[PDB]
Amino acid sequence: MGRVIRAQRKGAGSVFKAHVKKRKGAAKLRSLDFAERSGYIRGVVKDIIHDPGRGAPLAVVHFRDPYRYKIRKELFIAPEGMHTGQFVYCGRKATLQIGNVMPLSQMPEGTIICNLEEKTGDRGRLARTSGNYATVIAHNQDTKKTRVKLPSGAKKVVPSANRAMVGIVAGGGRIDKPILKAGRAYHKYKVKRNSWPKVRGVAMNPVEHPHGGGNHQHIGKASTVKRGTSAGRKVGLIAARRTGRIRGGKGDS
RNA sequence: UGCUUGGACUACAUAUGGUUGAGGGUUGUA
RNA sequence: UUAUAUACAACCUCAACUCAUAUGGGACUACCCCCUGAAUUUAAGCAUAUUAAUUAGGGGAGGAAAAGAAACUAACAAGGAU
RNA sequence: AACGUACCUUGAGCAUAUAUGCUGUGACCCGAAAGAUGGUGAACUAUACUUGAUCAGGUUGAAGUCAGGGGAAACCCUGAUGGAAGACCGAAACAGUUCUGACGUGCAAAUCGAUUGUCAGAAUUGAGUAUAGGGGCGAAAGACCAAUCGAACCAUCUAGUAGCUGGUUCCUUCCGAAGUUUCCCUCAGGAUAGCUGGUGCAUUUUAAUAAAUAAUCUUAUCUGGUAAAGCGAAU
């Protein structure tokens, strides 16, 4: 037997639950309702806020509700260069300037987008973190399927009616400065989750880790596991195609 | 109407009945 | 009378009610009915087997319960619910 | 006709009491480390949340700023200001380095004393919560999860099993051993024969008011290749 390993103990909850307390409330696009489906709609952007845990600022845009008398406040992923008191024009007949949202059909190839929709109407899934964006690389008038290029480089074929906000998302690129200390990684993660100080599993005892155990810190078995290899064995370099120093041909084609 | 002190009632699930009903369910007469 | 332009009357399906009247949820544990189900042990080791179709069970009843009036036995000179 | 045999050769059994033995059951008594079924714990400690409170005094002197001074410029040189930092010495606190000091039937089931480590942070703490046992939590020691942890605690299964240890309670009278053989996942145990006691029974001119057995010598007769002898017999 063993102990249940640490890789297995995160899917269960308690001390590997997210710390979602002061989070400002799930940034999404507005719902693809009617105004975005025939014309457009205008709302100002009242504040920029930093969600505690996030990496990119969020925008508190609020529009008018068209069928009720309410002002409907909305959190958006802020594209870069969005002051307060800007008018954002979310809809189909809007024009190309940042960060209006408009379906992929209207905006022309070569543009760069963010907070893109994956399935047509689902409020904003792809390319949402700071500094990232997705270029619209091509179109098709046959069955309306637009190729975008996502931040991994993998070129997806989304359909051509799902909304997206034009412009590269504000707050980048922040991964370029060293954290430098361990009490800046303590602070980085105390509002995200308990991916702790992560101990190396080669230094545990042979009960709690596959890699762990010996008289020397060493693996001995291979660190590339199979894909289907049955937690808590699937540990280390899962399902690895190649390993070692990649040279040149990282290129995603 | 304001307060006090006493009483009576108000749980869910269900069966038959009662009462108001709902439906581009199914027809009928206007 | 059904462009979802009103009403009527039925029926079906379905609601709601501090509606009128009713049941239901005990808990006991020796026996009883249905489940669910080990390992100690034994094998002079041990893995099927054994424990045991049993401890732990674990829901449901009665004064008993369950059963029960042959889709039964038998091969005879034939028997006859449980 | 031959071989076979748990069979027959004119019935001896059935019931029962007791003693001994062999086997099944708690099995003469007490004794495991363990396995399982269902429960109870985060009042201690680990971690995470939510909400509160806490840390004398100094020491250093980042950026930013201000004025002089040198320069064709580039830009530099000096004096202040300023008050940064998982920076410094240290109090409270939190920790526990050395003395291998005290103590060691304690003051204490981990404390006492001087000496040390940190001290504004990956800080220390309360309260409410959250995670439960082949599970949790872990800046990782198999650490901690109520003085319990290379698997908590509790009750039961259960009087688990034990080829091993310890014991096994009156007195006289009679007889009186074995440590060997064969087999065994057998070598601290069994089975198995030898040795033992009991209880009979049959009976003798070696049994009851021998012209016949049996075990040391003699006789007669077989066998033997050791002591001695031998290499002027073989090898």
Added chain:
RNA sequence: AGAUCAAGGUUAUGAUAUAAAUGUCCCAGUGGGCCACUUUUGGUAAGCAGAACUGGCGCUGUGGGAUGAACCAAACGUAAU
């Protein structure tokens, strides 16, 4: 190789007989042995290791060897001589 008759002297070494013969209960325990003469193998030796024979100790007291599991005498009901 047998089945019945005929003849056969004095029963065919010695000394022994605490009785022998035979079943059952293969009933209890035991299945660690040690010591010694002579024989003997391994070891250099060993109060070591392993066998053959007989006797002992184990189970056994008493007399002797000052002393002692096995040596030498001797085996043990209570007493006198």
Added chain:
RNA sequence: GGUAUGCGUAGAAGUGUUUGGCGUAAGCCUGCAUGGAGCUGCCAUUGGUACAGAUCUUGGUGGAUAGUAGCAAAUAAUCGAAUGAGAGCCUUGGAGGACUGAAGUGGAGAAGGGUUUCGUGUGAACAGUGGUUGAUCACGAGUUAGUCGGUCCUAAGUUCAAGGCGAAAGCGAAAAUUUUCAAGUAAAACAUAAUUU
């Protein structure tokens, strides 16, 4: 179970004992002592049937030592008086010399405690010395709220209409679907209206 026409408050069992014997022994009889109500011999048949051991069980007791180890951290008390059977205490009161030394050996609260609180008494026990004193013992008392708190709100979380699931019990349930699954309004007709999952 039968028997001894047994023994017994005129003294049963038991217990003690320099009572006296019997037995090879296990044992047994008997006198006296104490005791105060039951008991034995024999023939059967039986049993929870005999102890020196088991680091045996349970209770008691010895030596040590019946008074030995010891009652040594937190600087420290001393006078005289009153008590009182008895005073090194704390018993008290006056002098008193000292300690803590405001990050106290100070004054109050949280958790915890549960009457320890406070008067009047007081013997034993307890207070590892004593004790007249006591957080002890005995007996009487004592906690007063519109304003201080709870109560009210929601946090993490408990997750909780069964739509669901499971043989059930029940459920590592940020449900994500459960007709109105609504929280609703002095609101008109011909299910009050944009509305709230």
Added chain:
RNA sequence: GGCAACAGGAACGACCAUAAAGAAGCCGUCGAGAGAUAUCGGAAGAGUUUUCUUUUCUGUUUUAUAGCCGUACUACCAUGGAAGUCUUUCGCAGAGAGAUAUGGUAGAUGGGCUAGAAGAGCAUGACAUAUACUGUUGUGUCGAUAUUUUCUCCUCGGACCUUGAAAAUUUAUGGUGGGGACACGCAAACUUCUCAACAGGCCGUACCAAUAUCCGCAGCUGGUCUCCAAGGUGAAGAGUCUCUAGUCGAUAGAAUAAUGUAGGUAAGGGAAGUCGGCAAAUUAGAUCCGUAACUUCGGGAUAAGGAUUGGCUCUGAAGAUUG
């Protein structure tokens, strides 16, 4: 009403809607006041008198709630137009998107007055009354210096791949429709003004909070969250000493052997001791000088190595209001 900032005794919430308050961490921070402590003055009473000391000491206080004045501070308003740039902070903050100026508005958390305030009451100190529940005299007054030795208010900052609760409850304003709404008045006013009646239930409330009330089997040197906080010397909530409160309770007497546990000193030598300088010893605060290898240029560094310091009597420098 006021040009305006806004102002007054009230002056269509019944909804829909929007905004705000509730609603806040951390570290530092100019300034305001409180509280304390502190000198020098009045008073009133104690202390001390070897000798000397106009001494050395205590005491002098004003709760909520209100009324009014009220000004610092920050930001707005009006007139106005700024380079020869001026304003201003410890700190670099501002200004043609209106500076400096002159006048004003807002906020007052800040105090000063006066109600409370019966010489409130209190405190002190005289008396006086066998004495009880006592009658009574007289005081209570000036200035000033100091620290987050401590709270509170205000200001501006700082760090951050950290950016620092939700709801109850409250309030304002905006809105359509609806109500109030005569002028010869009678009035009204969930009136968001003033005044008056009445009521406010349930439950906790003693005491300890630990060298003796708690947990550790105990009157156990351990443990167990907070609040208040004096004088001295000093950088200091340090260490020694003391004031207010609090204790002398740790079984007591005699005596001072050996070995000890704890603390001192030791000639000469100075690590020879020892596994090893373990243990001890040395140095240490402050001012001034001065400082090496190496370096990630930041440090090293308090490197090293030196000098100074008491007491007494003097001199010089640093400020404030008035000129």
Added chain:
RNA sequence: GUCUAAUUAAAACAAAGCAUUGUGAUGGCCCUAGCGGGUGUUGACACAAUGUGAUUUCUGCCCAGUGCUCUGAAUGUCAAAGUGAAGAAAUUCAAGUAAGCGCGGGUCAACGGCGGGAGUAACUAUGACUCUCUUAAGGUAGCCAAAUGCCUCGUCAUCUAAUUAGUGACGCGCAUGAAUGGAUUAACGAGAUUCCUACUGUCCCUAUCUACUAUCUAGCGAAACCACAGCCAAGGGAACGGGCUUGGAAUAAUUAGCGGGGAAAGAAGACCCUUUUGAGCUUGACUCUAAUCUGGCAGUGUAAGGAGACAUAAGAGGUGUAG
């Protein structure tokens, strides 16, 4: 910074930095009996899995083995189901045969690995060179008697009066070596080690003063342990006696010490061996298993086209002597 509360605070963990891995949500890692969830209020500057461990300077070669992946050109293995055939049937046979495996490609900042012998330079020595045998590649930059070197107290220099220690070099390195990271590295360390000053009772070599004990007293008062006990030498014995045997000797009751014995007390030996006793851990152990992937069947429908013109409407072929 952090850990083994109650023997180890360290060089171990962590850490920033570096790098490899998976994943575009019908997803990746995870939990769940089942339903459903966690990351996730998430979206490649993100979540998840590892290794290395700041900086600097670097990171050689090997894809034979084991893994891991592949868009893998897939006749060799080959499940059930469906399929054909033989039989009266059970049944037996044959084709076909998915994923894996087999074959094949890629990867080592995946697990790991990283050679021999011979001959030679006008003195010996050494071998730049040469032969040659093997292998996947033969250990490259580098460092080193290393906390890593057996031999070893290696050899040389230094530090010393003397050094199995330290240091610095040398390198046929039993058995160094490059993110199993190599060589360095300033600052920092209750870390390991060496030496020089300073300083001393550590020592030569002990002495004395203090306090509290112990001591004696009054009061109070345990425990451990205990076969019976406690004078030796020698002998013999189960081979180290208080007891036996032979001597030596042998006199009460006691106080403070002491640490020779009692093979002294604790404690059914922590090592070791046995037990057909276990438990924790591993893994190409035997045998199972969750989850996973893969095939089949079920749910499971309506349309067209191509390959099947099958069962079928209907059509057509015939030359040996002779005739």
Added chain:
RNA sequence: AAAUGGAACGUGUAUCAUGAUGCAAGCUUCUUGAUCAAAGUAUCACGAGUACUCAGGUAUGAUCCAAUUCAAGGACAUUGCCAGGUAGGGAGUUUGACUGGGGCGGUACAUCUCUCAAAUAAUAACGGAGGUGUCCCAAGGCCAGCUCAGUGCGGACAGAAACCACACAUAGAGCAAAAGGGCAAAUGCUGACUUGAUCUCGGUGUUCAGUACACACAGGGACAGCAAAAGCUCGGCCUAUCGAUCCUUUUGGUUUAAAGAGUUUUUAACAAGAGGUGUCAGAAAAGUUACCAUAGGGAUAACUGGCUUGUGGCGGCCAAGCGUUCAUAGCGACGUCGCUUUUUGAUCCUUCGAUGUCGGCUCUUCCUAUCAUUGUGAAGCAAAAUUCACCAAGCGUUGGAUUGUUCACCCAUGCAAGGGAACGUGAGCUGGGUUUAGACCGUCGUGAGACAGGUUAGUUUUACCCUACUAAUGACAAAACGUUGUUGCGACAGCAUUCCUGCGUAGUACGAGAG
């Protein structure tokens, strides 16, 4: 679940010669404002109260059609059931015995031969030398014929060369193989012919329990082979060359059964073989634990004590010698004989319900196997210096650098620096070495983890008992006789002093001088 899919007027691009045709297309983009709740419109209520106060409803505004809330997939995924692969993530369990501890080795685990084995037979050790797990259609059977190792003399090419050839030739040859027996008109060699290497029933020998396999043997029955016959043959000239149950299998009856009855398939039964257990009287089975555990063991190691001596250490006999000459002043080759047991082992006697396991520090005493000192002897002894030997344990036998070590070597002292005993001495200390748990390297392992390799950090308890010892008081009685004091005596026990140097002696003796 808010505006889905149509169509329609609307305006424009565009075409067709004012049409139709296909498309755009019906309103919000300079600005941090604002919007909810119908205006208008028409027709009816078109009136009520009564011009007078006061009024609805519908569409329109805001076009009609058809519902599928809308999307994205979609007869796939998901799910049910089966099947294949995968799977130390998890589970259960195993991981031989023997053995001069265990492990490693090895096979002494089944079996055979000679020896041990001590004259029946039996007999043991991880005693000695070997063997076996096969081989053979002839190497089995049988009848006949011939004789082998070798040596000797001869013969063209002919030595060792072959091959022919005559005499000798007791097995010195051969007999599948180990060893032992055995065999000469064979059991050997060659030739003939062969299948008895078959079928059946019991019994005996061995092993022995006096059980089974297996091998062998003596027979009965049957069928055969060779041989003229007698006879011989039931494998191998004899002693090794082998394997249960269960299951699978095949061959055999012209088989028995399937239990309601018939026939056929099938299955089973019975008999004889086969498939194999080598750990061979026969489980189906990998490691590790320094994180550990229990039952035990002195049946069993590490540790003291005992016994033992290859090793350690050791002194006499005899002299080949060396010693210039000279054997023995001093040594002494090859021999030979004894002595000690602290190491090294050897064993496994004692202890595993525990004897604290290295050293050092401290402190005692004892032993001589004499280093120095006292007393002497000898010398290849002139003096000095030294060497040999005797009586001798009285007094000594040091300070330090490195290392945990003991011996160790080195500096220094010294006219001159012996060796040992309770493996002396841990409730004496210490804790440096080894030696639990932490951690790091190097090697080894796939790994857990290992290492008679290195490094670091690692809890050292109790005396108050008896005794011994050290000091301190000390009675009753007893007594060659009271109570008390004073002054003594010694039996007995202890026993302690020690070496060094300087000046004289004297530059003397001695020597040639140097000394």
